[PDB]
DNA sequence: AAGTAAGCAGTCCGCG
DNA sequence: GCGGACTGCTTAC
């Protein structure tokens, strides 16, 4: 097999590499890598190396990496560009793997671990590590085993061994319900003392040294805790055995609020699953406890135990250990679904970076572009410092607030990356500038044509047309991968809808789910067998389809994020190819494109309706348009349609056969106007939206920019079994809005769009009457809590103190004295509730850590003093008033003449 | 980490 | 009470 790296490090003048050799074995080597860098040289000097602008360079081979780094410094002293890849490990990887890496994940040791630390005096700080580690569960992907290290004797209590027999039993048998499918995979090791446990853990670690190291909060908790505990007991040399090269750095993570310590383990790639989830999931959660996320992702119930965690080991060691094991398994289950480790490996190996570098789009693109240029013997420019400067972004149309009955939406496929490719925007393709007219003059095609030679953006920039830049070349490659996975995702989605339909008529039989590939549209034969399946088999198939869709979603949306990150990186001062001329060329072209096409669509539709000056485009944001289809439906007449699906078909056909070709003609003209390299503006239909045929539903409404709701029947070619709401920006979509309130607001919107005013009024009346019964957590607001200290003045709110910060201070006074009450963590999220006048907490609100029940000593008082009136007005009535006034609808029945009977 | 546009909650204080 | 200037937070792209 082809060799591939596992990890790479620079340690002084050596590269330390762990890799998989041609026989599939893991090896480690130390290489005295001699790096090269480059200087510009005279034209007369024959060379094969040129910079991205075609200027000749001479290669400088250094005796070692320190000599190279020192040369960079002196070149700065002289004031001359030191060219080439200054991150020597990236150059090493490029030299050593000069081919597209094919990796075999089965050979990569992925370790998932979690530790337990009993602490009677509050949160056990990892920098101090003053308490024994009393449990470690460490799952190894190569062994497929959960290794459990269990401390039986501690100053905080001596306990009996954990029983695998009890662990397996149902909770109704007094057991722990450790999943039957992992029971046989547990290797249990009890220990008489902590020193023995830790020495054995280190020997185990030496034998089975993680390449990828993950778990939940491992970077901020488990890793530094383990490192520091071993350090305290045994000394530094022993703690450094966590690194395969015995090298560690105590690194600081800091922005503007504070600072925390992480331990860099050289020769390991730490991918903390909480950080993976935050970067790759495209959710924003009210809480990031593993309990919370596991429930959301897997629909598993929280791990329930009596009493505080600080007393769980002594009261119920059995459950304490079982929950440690289950916690490790839950992360594996989340990854089986989301496939973020697979994603990281794919992207890391593609770019030829340390795998942990996938968290940095800048590093990722730097490596991609370097490898691409190196292929042509081209030499990358030196990174420079730039002052941060603001620059313009997208255009967003101001909508008229209203209901909108029939709506069709369109938007550009991968807008910013397509603009880069179309215009040929790249550091080395800049050809010059032209005299810019106001943007509206381009939008209306009255400005002079910018260039008869070069490809232009309306910001004044011109680009070469003879050859693609490296940015367009490399962005195209990742775009094509994105396109492939999105195809699989959408096929799985369509397949899901087929199954949902068949579930209306399940057969009474005993049968099996079909063995199919959900990434491909079901054939006619498959569809026929589906119509004969039992509900049990159909539900299992639906589960499998939806898992396939999620896998496709992960693969596609993160590749989209990477390519959109390249467009953004051009406006990031840390990027090697930072250039506000290019960043603004993209965004300004985007503004033109949207407004140009708005004009064209209006012109087209006014022509097919025989009107003049009518605005068919009601809204647009960045690269999208929303077209009112009322007049199209009305031209045939509502009564001519058999059912909802009939007019949906008709609008789909109209969009595809009339609108899209007209859109395409408009964009081809724009391409010629800007003299662009290649027409790549592909604005395809997104949504077909409207009320159910014959109903009083309003179909949709806008309240303002980035705030709307549509009742959708078809989304990018997926025809839903049941209509689905597309809601953007409204409170139903915000993590800050109480859970029960999102739900209730969503139902109000459903009723408005699908059923109408009377239905809305009926629901509102019920919600208002019943809502006081809702669980306090379900009606609490949520906020991030930054800068708690700044606004704290002797335990009381300082000037300008934000409402949620006020609530935290209230909480802090109420739990003062307690070492054991949960502390609010700076930068984490809190639940927030308003408090009625004259409450014993002495302020108008209280906040506590999100994802948790408020501590028992104050819980009863919070419940008693919760201000339900304020909560309802602020989170429910105020937003609902906004939705209904925009939609010209009343949520409460107004008096009428009929009342007099 | 370090793409911009833009919405709403809340504080502070003016607005005769 | 609403509105602007402002901070804070959170979305839509
Ligand atoms: N830097 C950055 N830019 C973004 C992000 N989301 C959207 N944009 C910019 C770049 C996009 O091309 C543009 C249009 O946004 P869309 O959400 O419609 O995405 P795009 O058109 O790229 O992909 P699509 O094919 O519509 O799924 O807005 C983001 O998360 N980061
Ligand atoms: Ca735990
Ligand atoms: Ca788009
Ligand atoms: Ca599309
Ligand atoms: Ca059937
Ligand atoms: Ca869009």
Here the CATH topology of the largest domain equals Palm domain of DNA polymerase
What small molecules accompany the polymer chains? 2'-deoxyguanosine-5'-triphosphate, calcium ion
Helical amount: 40-55%
Give the CATH superfamily of the largest domain: B family DNA polymerase, palm domain
Cα shape = globular
Second CATH tier, the architecture of the largest domain:
Alpha-Beta Complex
Structural class estimated from helices and strands? alpha+beta
- Give the number of DSSP strands: 33
Report strand %. 15-25%
Distance between the termini: 88 Å
Radius of gyration: 31 Å
CATH first level of the largest domain: which class? Alpha Beta
Sheet with most strands: 8 strands, antiparallel
When the domains are counted, the total is: 6
**Count of separate DSSP helical elements:** 26
Protein name: DNA-directed DNA polymerase
EC number: 2.7.7.7, 3.1.11.-
Family: Belongs to the DNA polymerase type-B family.
Organism: Escherichia phage RB69 (Bacteriophage RB69)
């Amino acid at each position: 097999m082809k060799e591939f790296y596992l990890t790479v490090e620079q340690i002084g003048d050596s590269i330390f590499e762990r890799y998989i050799d041609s026989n599939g074995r893991e090896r480690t080597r130390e290489v005295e890598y001699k790096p090269s860098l480059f200087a510009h040289c005279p034209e007369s000097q024959a060379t094969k190396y040129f910079d991205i602008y075609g200027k000749p360079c001479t290669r400088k081979l250094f005796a070692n990496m320190r000599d190279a780094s020192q040369w960079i410094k002196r070149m700065e002293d002289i004031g001359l560009e030191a060219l080439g890849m200054d991150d020597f490990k990236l150059a090493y990887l490029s030299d050593t793997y000069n081919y597209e890496i094919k990796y075999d994940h089965t050979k990569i040791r992925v370790a998932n671990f979690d530790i337990e630390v009993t602490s009677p005096d509050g949160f056990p700080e990892p920098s101090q590590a003053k308490h024994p580690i009393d449990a470690i569960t460490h799952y190894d992907s190569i062994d497929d085993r959960f290794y459990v290290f269990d401390l039986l004797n501690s100053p905080y209590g001596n306990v009996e061994e954990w029983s695998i027999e009890i662990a397996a039993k149902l909770q109704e048998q007094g057991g722990d319900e450790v999943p039957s499918e992992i029971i046989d995979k547990i290797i249990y090791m009890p220990f008489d003392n902590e020193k023995e446990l830790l020495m054995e853990y280190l020997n185990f670690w030496q034998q089975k040294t993680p390449v990828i190291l993950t778990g939940w909060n491992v970077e901020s908790f488990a890793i530094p805790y383990v490192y520091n505990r071993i350090k305290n007991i045994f000394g530094e040399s022993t703690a450094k055995r966590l690194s395969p090269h015995r090298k560690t750095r105590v690194k600081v993570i800091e922005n503007m609020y504070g600072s925390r310590e992480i331990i860099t383990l050289f020769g390991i790639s730490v991918l903390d699953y909480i950080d993976l989830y935050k970067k790759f999931s495209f959710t924003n959660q009210p809480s990031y406890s593993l309990d919370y996320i596991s429930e959301f992702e897997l629909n598993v119930g929280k791990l329930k135990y009596d009493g505080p965690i600080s007393k769980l080991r002594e009261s119920n060691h059995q459950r304490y250990i079982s929950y440690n094991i289950i916690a490790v398994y839950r992360v594996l289950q989340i990854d089986a679904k989301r496939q973020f480790i697979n994603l990281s490996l794919d992207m890391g190996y593609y770019a030829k970076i340390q795998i942990q570098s996938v968290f940095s789009p800048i590093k990722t693109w730097d490596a991609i572009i370097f490898n691409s240029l190196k292929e042509q013997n081209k030499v990358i420019p030196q990174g420079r410092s730039h002052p941060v400067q603001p620059y313009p972004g997208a255009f967003v149309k101001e909508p008229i607030p209203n209901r909108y009955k029939y709506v069709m939406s369109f938007d550009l496929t991968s807008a910013y990356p397509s603009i880069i490719r179309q215009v040929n925007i790249s550091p080395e393709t800049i050809a010059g500038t032209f005299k810019v007219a106001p943007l509206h003059d381009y939008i209306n095609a009255v400005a002079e044509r910018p260039s008869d030679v070069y490809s232009c953006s309306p910001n004044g920039m011109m680009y070469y047309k003879d050859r693609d830049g490296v940015v367009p070349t490399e962005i195209t490659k990742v775009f094509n991968q994105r396109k492939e996975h999105k195809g699989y995702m959408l096929a799985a989605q369509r397949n899901g809808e087929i199954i949902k339909e068949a579930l209306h008529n399940p057969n009474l039989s005993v049968d099996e789910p079909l063995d199919v590939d959900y990434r491909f549209d079901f054939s006619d034969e498959i569809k026929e067998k589906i119509k004969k399946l039992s509900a049990k088999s159909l539900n299992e198939m639906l589960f499998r389809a939806q898992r396939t869709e999620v896998a496709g979603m992960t693969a596609q949306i993160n590749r989209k994020a990477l390519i959109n990150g390249l467009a953004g990186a051009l406006g990031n001062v840390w990027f090697r190819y930072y250039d506000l001329r290019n960043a603004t060329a993209i965004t300004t072209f985007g503004q033109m494109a949207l407004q140009w096409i708005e004009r064209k669509v209006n012109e087209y539709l006014n022509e097919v309706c025989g009107t003049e000056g009518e605005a068919f485009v009601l809204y647009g944001d960045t690269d999208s348009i929303y077209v009112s289809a009322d007049k199209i439906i009305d031209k045939v007449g509502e009564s001519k349609f058999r059912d909802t699906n009939h007019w949906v078909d008709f609008l789909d056909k109209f969009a595809r056969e009339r609108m899209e070709p007209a859109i395409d003609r408009g964009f081809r003209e724009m391409c010629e106007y800007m003299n662009n390299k290649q027409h790549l503006m592909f604005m395809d239909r997104e949504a077909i939206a409207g009320p159910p045929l014959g109903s009083k539903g309003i179909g949709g409404f806008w309240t303002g920019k980035k705030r709307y709701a549509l009742n959708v029947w078809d989304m990018e070619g997926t025809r839903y079994a049941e209509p689905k709401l597309k809601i953007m920006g409204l409170e139903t979509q915000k993590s800050s809005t109480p859970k029960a309130v999102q739900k209730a607001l969503k139902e109000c919107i459903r009723r408005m769009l699908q059923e109408g005013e009377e239905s809305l009024q009926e629901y509102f009346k019920e919600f208002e009457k019943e809502f006081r019964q809702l669980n306090y957590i379900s009606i609490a607001s949520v906020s991030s809590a930054n800068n708690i200290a700044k606004y704290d003045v002797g335990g009381f709110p300082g000037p300008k103190c934000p409402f949620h910060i006020r609530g935290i201070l209230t909480y802090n006074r109420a739990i003062k004295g307690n070492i054991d009450a949960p502390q609010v963590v700076e930068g984490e999220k809190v639940y927030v509730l308003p408090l009625r006048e004259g409450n014993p907490f002495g302020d108008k609100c209280i906040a506590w850590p999100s994802g948790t029940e408020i501590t028992d000593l104050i819980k009863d008082d919070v419940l008693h003093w919760m201000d339900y009136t304020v909560l309802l007005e602020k989170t429910f009535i105020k937003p609902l008033e906004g939705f209904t006034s925009a939609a010209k609808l009343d949520y409460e029945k107004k008096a009428s003449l009929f009342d007099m009977f």
